[model samples]
Target chain A: SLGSDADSAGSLIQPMQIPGIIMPGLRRLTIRDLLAQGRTSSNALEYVREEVFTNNADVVAEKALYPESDITFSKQTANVKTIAHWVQASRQVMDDAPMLQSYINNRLMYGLALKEEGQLLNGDGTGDNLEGLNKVATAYDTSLNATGDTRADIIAHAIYQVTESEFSASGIVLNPRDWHNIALLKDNEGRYIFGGPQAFTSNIMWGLPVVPTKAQAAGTFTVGGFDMASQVWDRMDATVEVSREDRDNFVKNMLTILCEERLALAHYRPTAIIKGTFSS
Target chain B: SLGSDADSAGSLIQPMQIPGIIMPGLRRLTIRDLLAQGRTSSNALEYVREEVFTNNADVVAEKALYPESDITFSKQTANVKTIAHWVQASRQVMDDAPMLQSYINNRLMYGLALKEEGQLLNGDGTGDNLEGLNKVATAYDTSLNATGDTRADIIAHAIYQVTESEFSASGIVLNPRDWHNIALLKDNEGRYIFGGPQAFTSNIMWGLPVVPTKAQAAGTFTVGGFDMASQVWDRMDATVEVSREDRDNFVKNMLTILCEERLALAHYRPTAIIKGTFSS
Candidate 1:
């Protein structure tokens, strides 16, 4: 068996590891990947928000004439919410030894399942599916752009919303087309809008690193304190395994190659995100 | 106060987070990323390859020591390996007040540090610096892809020879373009050489999931039992700190936005890999 010929086994040519179509608004990384490096769930993430208030706004220090100044207190809390989903890509009925094994394991397991998560992640959360980028509420209205604003204008407005809440803006997610427009928008006389091509070469536009993902449809953009807005609670990482002997998968020598993971995307601060749409 | 003011303060436009410019074959994710998802290093990694191997090929017959069979048992161990390197990217001289703080903090500190580490990982152990993919051992002798062999042929050959040593192949690393050629190499005709796009889409190519990155050069590639090839030891996770007083930086009305972490890569089984050059 040590000298068993690979030629006798099989040889496959595959397209592997395509970048996720999901844009990097929240800086997606698996929870397992973070833990190995000594990071806990709360190191860079906190899904629970707690608040406390006292009647200090109405209390005075004036000798406390009689007694306690009638001080009152209040407390509020918000727990993490789960917005989880799943995706699938597969082929069936291919009984060819070379074909079924290669296609199901590689195509269905890796790219189709793994990569398809991106589109679902970008969903706006109206359906039973994903709570995507467009669904997050914005402090600024997208309609503000119709007046006399550019993409930069709307983005700046959204960023101000984040900072106004005292949370700093950490990243921006945009479509490739919007990024191109931002980087190359020209003046009346043809002077390039932002710095020329040389300055914008590193995928940074308008001072922020732009995550140009197919997940984000053109005509919409999101700017946020993504570091503060949400937490991705991965219930599971991806796993590819043999399937149940259903659909005559086993007897026919055709087994399904599947990929599965469970995760919840929860927002802690609704004020942290600034979602907007662009018409031009 | 929601629509109360912002444009009045003159916030034209600027980007927030900048993704690391470094992109490569490694599905680069830190330890925390994996751990959060319940994956341990042993699940897909063995940084420390411990072997109790002995030079002698002789084994004692059960309970029949011939009395002359002086069985002196000994244990040999190879501990965690390390390849540590350092680099820096900075903004110096005059520290201006207008410098975008979060952009510099998140982008320069996190994305930059994260991205910069990718290239050092690809170092080849030459030039008194990190080992890039090309310079690393198995830097494509060109003989492996000798006449009468196609790229996949050489890959199968190398895997064959490696498994001949009793080591199973885990993964393959190649240039994206190289993969394109592999995925697209047609016969004299224009038909899809392999299973066509629908079938071949996956991380697997030749019985192993292929990692395609810019780190490896165009004409060269490497195959290995990467799950045991090396160990990634973390020194620390990314940390962001602000310095207002350093060398009169505060007096100049500026702050230093910095992020840093440390880690080491240990290759326990150098022979686990077979590096080669491609003619096609």
Candidate 2:
């Protein structure tokens, strides 16, 4: 009977500790720590704003934040220490604070940056307004304070400016934040090197990461002495035609210069002659 | 066509002026000059005689003669300038001679000199016979002579003495001329550290150069650590089994004695105490 009682008590003790102290402490710590660590909190807020709002403004406006959530003294007091501990522990675990801050900054920068799709309109005049909208978004993203609570408000102000500037400057009206159909267009030809799928769609076909499938399909193309895939323009249907004679001549010139230059710089030495005349 | 005939005629014709009268005289002069400048024939003959025989009995028994082949004809007609030149050329094409000599010497000294192999049976049993043979072989291999023929004869004499002594004294009969087989057997025990395939058997199951496949199959009861298949014998197998426990015990004993010895030599200085006091 005593053994059964001891076993029952052992199982109940662990379960009681979980609901009684662990869950509440975990939740409180998560919230409190997010607030106390100014830089990380700012970063998290920026990520949420860019990834959730600018990218999917409709979803954020309709469902992300609710106004009915309670804020109280007893709840705040209970959760503050827990949150502080969590933030402190996480900061210690992740090594340097700057590294995590930089990672968050990079994510936000990428999120709010111009997508590549808008760059294709440069030659065509069809989507110049989209390009202007993207520029406004980038300026706003970069201008925000990366280490304070003001970052969230600054990002919000940027979004408003982007929307207003696009409408007023380009006379191209954009969908409201509630509209799910309006997606941020990227500017592929922009300075940022890693243009994502959306960004790649808007840039000129000359610069793009070679995907294996495209490389296999189009065979290889030699350009500027680099053997690249003809499928470089896979995202765009319009392929640039190069004449065979021109390509051959270009390749020949490149190869000759490359080979001769390499040979000249290779392990080479000049010979010296010491000549003397002697009478035997 | 005439062009084809002209090309053929061009190839057949001598391109430069031929020294018709002076050529024979020039060749004769060259031969006379070379003979005069070449290694002295006296030392060469003595070197050859010494190398070919261990003593007068071996020389007579093998029918070995001074300048074994006609030296005058060889010197005048052979394209090679000297025996040294011939040996150098031979070495360029073949790796047999020196490697075989080394193999035999190493086998006699290290592998065959063991007590279990009846190395102590030479009545005197002082191991002087093996030691003497080693000294002779080593001296021959290292010494400089006027010509390679002289060197070869010296090496031959040493080889003959070793083989003869090993055969007569230990009853271990082996052909004096079977340098290759001697090399192979020596190679089997890894005595000739660098003699490649010719001196060693390339069987993987038996250790390289001289795997013990036939001996093992013949049920030759080998009690030593030599593994014929792997061509490597555990040299320490006869003395001790080197298990982890043994290694630990050895290390502990060594550490204890080493500590005591160091302290004793250093006038019982408290090394640890001194370091602890100063380092912190």
Candidate 3:
């Protein structure tokens, strides 16, 4: 409610207030600050995520069965496992803020972590690499630590192993750095090995969608049945709540963007997921 | 301070003065015209979905299965079936502005109809149809025209038939539209089939929840002992909270309402969810 009638500012796009010092009449914060600290997570976590009902979801993330008495009517089954994790949105800085009357991006990142290394809690209850793909196992596994090994060969090895386990490979996950290397790889003849032209090499390979994640080791990578080997479960998605009820937070004029959600992994057939390793 | 030296509007209402347009005037809730529609129960009138949740809840919102009767044998004189019961589906809905917690249970009856008169359509040995029958159930595509039966009579036969032969039937499920049509079912002389407009007056028509869900076809239904055939589990309960110690949000004169929860399910009984169709 403007008591005074100076109705003149609706037509110009307001610039964001960059925190820290303001110089002479000009606001601070610049594009260089954003690019200098560009950290991010993965987005292809949804495909392999199998939805389960509980954190205690007992499942055969990997299955192993040996042929029994050839004529016996008795049948054998696979072995299973489970994992627990927390979805979080910590102290936020600023992005201008809220559309759709909601804080959406905060909720999705949790789903993103369901992949790769499981974040382990430290003594102070902070976190470390999450227990994920590095653990998706079965009867066959391999490493590309050999000096002459190429990433394409590791990926090819994974596809074959997944098949030997009895399922078709559907997706791939790796550090963006490695994928970048593969995308830019070529034969000694100066010809591209993966039909590289950059145009058709966006985020795909061997007819499968490639999932690039920062959580992946810059050197190691994996391939498997994302839609079949495991299930992605969310005990809860991210949500935002407002309050003027904090200690003079209203007076300090400071607002919070606290967010949280629960997520779990149901590894039904570890054989379906082949975690491979290679030199960075 | 506007109250001190060289008075100006810099201190009148920070966020608005700093933004593109919080707008101006006596009560500029202009863009805030986005009046929130509060909360809803996901409890849209779904009758077949209620019986599938553990214990009881009046709405048809989410899912994640449990493994109650996984294949185990301390030993038995005889055996019935093993694939396990499968409860499925939550219908699509919009807005929770209206509030009335209604429900429907006894959804395990449809398995029988297909065993007799209907059949699955045949997929890649992996889809919902069977063109023939499936390891899941028999196929039967018939109706309730009333020669030696009523919709109610066919329902009763499924219960008795299943119990003395395979498993016992403790529940029934159907579409509310089907029930209403059944309720309004009349003879050529305008007489009710299972009691006109208000004869067999009760939601518990056969000592079952009569669960209805859009997931079920209006012309079809199912019956079975859901709790006895499979399992359902949840990793965590849905969680919700409010926070204000966030970033630019406070300075933007705003706060957030956030919520999340994770759940998962394992279906051990595919036979439990038998699909069948009939005429009204």
Candidate maximizing TM-score: 1
Q: After superposition, how far is residue B112 of candidate 3 from its true place, in Å?
A: 31
lDDT of 2 by residue, B1-280 (tens): 3422455643443222111111000001110111112222221121111223323232343555643432221121111110000000123222443443333232222221232222111112122121111111112222322353321233233333423323211111111122222332222222222232212222221121222211111111111111110011111112111122333444433211000000000001111010000000
Query: Which parts of model 1 have CA positions greater than 4 angstroms off?
Result: A1-47, A51-121, A124-128, A142-147, A195-200, B1-280
User: How many collisions between residues are there in candidate 1?
Assistant: 38
iRMSD computed for candidate 3: 29.4
Better of 2 and 3 by DockQ: 3
Each prediction's whole-model lDDT (CA) = 0.47, 0.19, 0.39
TM-score of each: 0.37, 0.12, 0.31
| Model 1 docking tier (incorrect/acceptable/medium/high) | incorrect
State the lDDT at A270 in candidate 2.
7
Candidate with the greatest lDDT versus the true structure: 1
Model 3 C-alpha lDDT per residue in residues A132-229, reported as the tens digit of each score: 54554543344312234456645655665665444667777777787877766654456564444755645665556777766566766667766655
Worst 10 residues of 2 chain B by lDDT: B257-266
